[PDB]
Amino acid sequence: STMGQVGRQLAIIGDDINRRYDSEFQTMLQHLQPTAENAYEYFTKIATSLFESGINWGRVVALLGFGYRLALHVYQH
Amino acid sequence: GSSTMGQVGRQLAIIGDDINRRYDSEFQTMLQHLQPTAENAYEYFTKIATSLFESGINWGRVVALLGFGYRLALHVYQH
Protein backbone atom coordinates (compact mmCIF):
# COMPACT_ATOMS: atom_id res chain seq x y z
CA SER A 1 0.00 0.00 0.00
CA THR A 2 3.07 2.14 0.32
CA MET A 3 3.30 1.20 -3.36
CA GLY A 4 0.51 3.69 -3.96
CA GLN A 5 2.39 6.41 -2.07
CA VAL A 6 5.50 6.03 -4.23
CA GLY A 7 3.22 5.62 -7.24
CA ARG A 8 1.48 8.91 -6.46
CA GLN A 9 4.79 10.79 -6.26
CA LEU A 10 5.76 9.47 -9.71
CA ALA A 11 2.39 10.65 -11.04
CA ILE A 12 3.21 14.18 -9.90
CA ILE A 13 6.72 14.01 -11.36
CA GLY A 14 5.48 12.61 -14.66
CA ASP A 15 2.62 15.09 -14.91
CA ASP A 16 5.09 17.90 -14.17
CA ILE A 17 7.50 16.53 -16.78
CA ASN A 18 4.65 16.14 -19.26
CA ARG A 19 3.65 19.82 -19.11
CA ARG A 20 7.00 21.52 -18.41
CA TYR A 21 8.62 20.72 -21.77
CA ASP A 22 5.59 19.87 -23.94
CA SER A 23 5.58 23.43 -25.31
CA GLU A 24 9.32 23.37 -26.04
CA PHE A 25 8.89 20.22 -28.14
CA GLN A 26 6.23 21.77 -30.38
CA THR A 27 8.38 24.86 -30.99
CA MET A 28 11.18 22.67 -32.33
CA LEU A 29 8.68 20.73 -34.45
CA GLN A 30 7.38 23.91 -36.10
CA HIS A 31 10.92 25.09 -36.86
CA LEU A 32 11.69 21.63 -38.24
CA GLN A 33 8.42 21.08 -40.10
CA PRO A 34 9.08 17.33 -40.29
CA THR A 35 7.54 14.89 -42.75
CA ALA A 36 7.60 11.12 -43.22
CA GLU A 37 10.42 11.54 -45.76
CA ASN A 38 12.83 13.35 -43.41
CA ALA A 39 11.75 12.33 -39.89
CA TYR A 40 14.18 9.42 -39.63
CA GLU A 41 17.20 11.40 -40.85
CA TYR A 42 16.31 14.39 -38.67
CA PHE A 43 15.92 12.16 -35.62
CA THR A 44 19.08 10.08 -36.09
CA LYS A 45 21.51 12.98 -36.52
CA ILE A 46 19.85 15.03 -33.77
CA ALA A 47 20.27 12.00 -31.50
CA THR A 48 23.93 11.58 -32.46
CA SER A 49 24.81 15.25 -31.94
CA LEU A 50 22.99 15.29 -28.60
CA PHE A 51 24.72 12.16 -27.30
CA GLU A 52 28.21 12.84 -28.69
CA SER A 53 28.13 16.03 -26.60
CA GLY A 54 27.29 13.90 -23.53
CA ILE A 55 24.73 11.32 -22.44
CA ASN A 56 22.78 11.03 -19.19
CA TRP A 57 19.37 9.69 -18.23
CA GLY A 58 17.74 13.11 -18.60
CA ARG A 59 19.10 13.49 -22.12
CA VAL A 60 17.81 10.02 -22.99
CA VAL A 61 14.43 11.09 -21.60
CA ALA A 62 14.51 14.34 -23.59
CA LEU A 63 15.28 12.45 -26.79
CA LEU A 64 12.58 9.84 -26.16
CA GLY A 65 10.02 12.59 -25.65
CA PHE A 66 11.23 14.41 -28.75
CA GLY A 67 10.96 11.22 -30.79
CA TYR A 68 7.47 10.56 -29.45
CA ARG A 69 6.24 14.04 -30.36
CA LEU A 70 8.06 13.82 -33.70
CA ALA A 71 6.13 10.62 -34.47
CA LEU A 72 2.84 12.26 -33.48
CA HIS A 73 3.71 15.23 -35.71
CA VAL A 74 4.46 13.05 -38.74
CA TYR A 75 1.35 10.90 -38.29
CA GLN A 76 -0.89 13.99 -38.19
CA HIS A 77 0.86 15.45 -41.27
CA GLY B 1 18.89 21.68 -42.52
CA SER B 2 22.51 21.29 -41.46
CA SER B 3 23.31 23.68 -38.60
CA THR B 4 19.64 23.32 -37.60
CA MET B 5 20.30 19.85 -36.19
CA GLY B 6 22.90 21.25 -33.78
CA GLN B 7 20.52 23.90 -32.47
CA VAL B 8 17.72 21.41 -31.75
CA GLY B 9 20.27 18.97 -30.35
CA ARG B 10 21.53 21.70 -28.02
CA GLN B 11 17.97 22.50 -26.92
CA LEU B 12 17.46 18.82 -26.05
CA ALA B 13 20.75 18.88 -24.12
CA ILE B 14 19.44 21.78 -22.04
CA ILE B 15 16.08 20.06 -21.48
CA GLY B 16 17.74 16.76 -20.60
CA ASP B 17 20.20 18.40 -18.22
CA ASP B 18 17.35 20.30 -16.57
CA ILE B 19 15.41 17.04 -16.19
CA ASN B 20 18.46 15.19 -14.84
CA ARG B 21 18.90 17.60 -11.90
CA ARG B 22 15.28 18.66 -11.31
CA TYR B 23 14.08 15.25 -10.05
CA ASP B 24 17.26 13.41 -9.02
CA SER B 25 16.70 14.39 -5.39
CA GLU B 26 13.06 13.27 -5.43
CA PHE B 27 14.05 9.80 -6.70
CA GLN B 28 16.72 9.20 -4.05
CA THR B 29 14.20 10.06 -1.33
CA MET B 30 11.88 7.36 -2.71
CA LEU B 31 14.72 4.83 -2.78
CA GLN B 32 15.72 5.57 0.82
CA HIS B 33 12.08 5.31 1.93
CA LEU B 34 11.67 1.97 0.11
CA GLN B 35 15.05 0.35 0.87
CA PRO B 36 14.92 -2.02 -2.12
CA THR B 37 16.99 -5.17 -2.51
CA ALA B 38 17.53 -7.62 -5.35
CA GLU B 39 14.87 -9.88 -3.80
CA ASN B 40 12.10 -7.24 -3.67
CA ALA B 41 13.05 -4.75 -6.41
CA TYR B 42 10.95 -6.48 -9.08
CA GLU B 43 7.84 -6.73 -6.89
CA TYR B 44 8.34 -3.12 -5.78
CA PHE B 45 8.66 -1.95 -9.39
CA THR B 46 5.73 -3.89 -10.85
CA LYS B 47 3.25 -2.81 -8.17
CA ILE B 48 4.41 0.81 -8.40
CA ALA B 49 4.12 0.70 -12.21
CA THR B 50 0.62 -0.81 -12.20
CA SER B 51 -0.75 1.68 -9.67
CA LEU B 52 0.93 4.57 -11.52
CA PHE B 53 -0.47 3.63 -14.93
CA GLU B 54 -3.92 2.45 -13.82
CA SER B 55 -4.50 5.99 -12.52
CA GLY B 56 -3.58 7.34 -15.97
CA ILE B 57 -0.71 7.13 -18.44
CA ASN B 58 1.07 9.85 -20.41
CA TRP B 59 4.57 10.31 -21.81
CA GLY B 60 5.82 12.03 -18.65
CA ARG B 61 4.61 9.21 -16.41
CA VAL B 62 6.28 6.64 -18.65
CA VAL B 63 9.44 8.77 -18.39
CA ALA B 64 9.16 9.05 -14.60
CA LEU B 65 8.78 5.28 -14.30
CA LEU B 66 11.75 4.56 -16.58
CA GLY B 67 13.92 6.87 -14.49
CA PHE B 68 12.67 5.28 -11.29
CA GLY B 69 13.48 1.84 -12.66
CA TYR B 70 16.94 3.02 -13.69
CA ARG B 71 17.71 4.54 -10.28
CA LEU B 72 16.14 1.54 -8.55
CA ALA B 73 18.55 -0.69 -10.48
CA LEU B 74 21.49 1.56 -9.56
CA HIS B 75 20.42 1.48 -5.91
CA VAL B 76 20.18 -2.31 -5.77
CA TYR B 77 23.54 -2.72 -7.52
CA GLN B 78 25.22 -0.53 -4.88
CA HIS B 79 23.86 -2.83 -2.13
Short mmCIF file of C-alpha atoms in Angstrom, two decimals, chain A residues 2-22 24-25 27-28 31-32 41-43 45-46 49-50 53 56-66 68-69, chain B residues 1 4-20 22-24 26-27 29-30 33-34 43-45 47-48 51-52 55 58-68 70-71:
data_model
loop_
_atom_site.label_atom_id
_atom_site.label_comp_id
_atom_site.label_asym_id
_atom_site.label_seq_id
_atom_site.Cartn_x
_atom_site.Cartn_y
_atom_site.Cartn_z
CA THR A 2 3.07 2.14 0.32
CA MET A 3 3.30 1.20 -3.36
CA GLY A 4 0.51 3.69 -3.96
CA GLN A 5 2.39 6.41 -2.07
CA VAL A 6 5.50 6.03 -4.23
CA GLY A 7 3.22 5.62 -7.24
CA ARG A 8 1.48 8.91 -6.46
CA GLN A 9 4.79 10.79 -6.26
CA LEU A 10 5.76 9.47 -9.71
CA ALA A 11 2.39 10.65 -11.04
CA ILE A 12 3.21 14.18 -9.90
CA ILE A 13 6.72 14.01 -11.36
CA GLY A 14 5.48 12.61 -14.66
CA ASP A 15 2.62 15.09 -14.91
CA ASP A 16 5.09 17.90 -14.17
CA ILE A 17 7.50 16.53 -16.78
CA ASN A 18 4.65 16.14 -19.26
CA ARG A 19 3.65 19.82 -19.11
CA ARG A 20 7.00 21.52 -18.41
CA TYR A 21 8.62 20.72 -21.77
CA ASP A 22 5.59 19.87 -23.94
CA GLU A 24 9.32 23.37 -26.04
CA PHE A 25 8.89 20.22 -28.14
CA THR A 27 8.38 24.86 -30.99
CA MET A 28 11.18 22.67 -32.33
CA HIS A 31 10.92 25.09 -36.86
CA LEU A 32 11.69 21.63 -38.24
CA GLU A 41 17.20 11.40 -40.85
CA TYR A 42 16.31 14.39 -38.67
CA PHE A 43 15.92 12.16 -35.62
CA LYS A 45 21.51 12.98 -36.52
CA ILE A 46 19.85 15.03 -33.77
CA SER A 49 24.81 15.25 -31.94
CA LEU A 50 22.99 15.29 -28.60
CA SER A 53 28.13 16.03 -26.60
CA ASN A 56 22.78 11.03 -19.19
CA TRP A 57 19.37 9.69 -18.23
CA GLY A 58 17.74 13.11 -18.60
CA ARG A 59 19.10 13.49 -22.12
CA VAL A 60 17.81 10.02 -22.99
CA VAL A 61 14.43 11.09 -21.60
CA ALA A 62 14.51 14.34 -23.59
CA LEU A 63 15.28 12.45 -26.79
CA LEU A 64 12.58 9.84 -26.16
CA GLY A 65 10.02 12.59 -25.65
CA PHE A 66 11.23 14.41 -28.75
CA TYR A 68 7.47 10.56 -29.45
CA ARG A 69 6.24 14.04 -30.36
CA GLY B 1 18.89 21.68 -42.52
CA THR B 4 19.64 23.32 -37.60
CA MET B 5 20.30 19.85 -36.19
CA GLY B 6 22.90 21.25 -33.78
CA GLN B 7 20.52 23.90 -32.47
CA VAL B 8 17.72 21.41 -31.75
CA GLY B 9 20.27 18.97 -30.35
CA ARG B 10 21.53 21.70 -28.02
CA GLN B 11 17.97 22.50 -26.92
CA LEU B 12 17.46 18.82 -26.05
CA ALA B 13 20.75 18.88 -24.12
CA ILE B 14 19.44 21.78 -22.04
CA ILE B 15 16.08 20.06 -21.48
CA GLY B 16 17.74 16.76 -20.60
CA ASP B 17 20.20 18.40 -18.22
CA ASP B 18 17.35 20.30 -16.57
CA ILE B 19 15.41 17.04 -16.19
CA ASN B 20 18.46 15.19 -14.84
CA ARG B 22 15.28 18.66 -11.31
CA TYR B 23 14.08 15.25 -10.05
CA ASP B 24 17.26 13.41 -9.02
CA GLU B 26 13.06 13.27 -5.43
CA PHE B 27 14.05 9.80 -6.70
CA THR B 29 14.20 10.06 -1.33
CA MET B 30 11.88 7.36 -2.71
CA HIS B 33 12.08 5.31 1.93
CA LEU B 34 11.67 1.97 0.11
CA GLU B 43 7.84 -6.73 -6.89
CA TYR B 44 8.34 -3.12 -5.78
CA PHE B 45 8.66 -1.95 -9.39
CA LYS B 47 3.25 -2.81 -8.17
CA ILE B 48 4.41 0.81 -8.40
CA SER B 51 -0.75 1.68 -9.67
CA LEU B 52 0.93 4.57 -11.52
CA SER B 55 -4.50 5.99 -12.52
CA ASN B 58 1.07 9.85 -20.41
CA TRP B 59 4.57 10.31 -21.81
CA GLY B 60 5.82 12.03 -18.65
CA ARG B 61 4.61 9.21 -16.41
CA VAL B 62 6.28 6.64 -18.65
CA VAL B 63 9.44 8.77 -18.39
CA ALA B 64 9.16 9.05 -14.60
CA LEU B 65 8.78 5.28 -14.30
CA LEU B 66 11.75 4.56 -16.58
CA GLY B 67 13.92 6.87 -14.49
CA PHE B 68 12.67 5.28 -11.29
CA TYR B 70 16.94 3.02 -13.69
CA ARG B 71 17.71 4.54 -10.28
#
